[PDB]
């Protein structure tokens, strides 16, 4: 028999990722470069590994949409919900929806895409919302200004809650 797992994780470290569609913000390869960038966060302080696929299934499923775009969560215009991401699962299960009516930038113009990717990211791995305003999986939006990307330690202890550390 088998019962089901407690924990809404990934029970395998080498997970694969696909970009569904682009958003006609940033070009292709600077999307690609922000999505890498935004799973190197999360690489770099446990034992998962992240592959991009071209084609298939990937567990993480990324794309772009507005308003509804095929499940309960739709998105709303400028602001406010910028992307949502469903916890470890099959199917939907890690899944990524950026709202194609923000303004997506490698800048600190509009919305960073790295930046808010990394974050969906972190629920795509298991991660609920921060109640620490400085946390990366604090629910909204703060770019501080700072020149260098660093997890804050909020994030660290809570994906390693549930991965332990890289080595
Ligand atoms: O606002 C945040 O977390 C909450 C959130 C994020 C995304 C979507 C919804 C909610 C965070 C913002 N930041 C940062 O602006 N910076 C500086 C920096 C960023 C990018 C590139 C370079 C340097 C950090 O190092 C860390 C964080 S965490
Ligand atoms: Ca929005
Ligand atoms: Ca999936
Ligand atoms: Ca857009
Ligand atoms: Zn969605
Ligand atoms: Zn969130």
Do not use: C
């Amino acid at each position: 028999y088998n019962v089901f797992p407690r924990t809404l994780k990934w029970s395998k470290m080498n997970l694969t990722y696909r970009i569904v569609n682009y958003t006609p913000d940033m070009t292709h390869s600077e999307v690609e470069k922000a999505f890498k960038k935004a799973f190197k966060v999360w690489s770099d302080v446990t034992p998962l590994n992240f592959t991009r696929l071209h084609d298939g299934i990937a567990d993480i499923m990324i794309s772009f949409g507005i308003k509804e775009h095929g499940d309960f969560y739709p998105f709303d215009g400028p602001s406010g919900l910028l992307a949502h991401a469903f916890p470890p699962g099959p199917n939907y299960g890690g899944d990524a929806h950026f709202d194609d009516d923000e303004t997506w930038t490698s800048s600190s113009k509009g919305y960073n895409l790295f930046l808010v990717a990394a974050h969906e990211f972190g629920h795509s791995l298991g991660l609920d919302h921060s109640k620490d305003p400085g946390a990366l999986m604090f629910p909204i939006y703060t770019y501080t200004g700072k020149s260098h990307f660093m997890l804050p330690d909020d994030d660290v202890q809570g994906i390693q809650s549930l991965y332990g550390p890289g080595d």
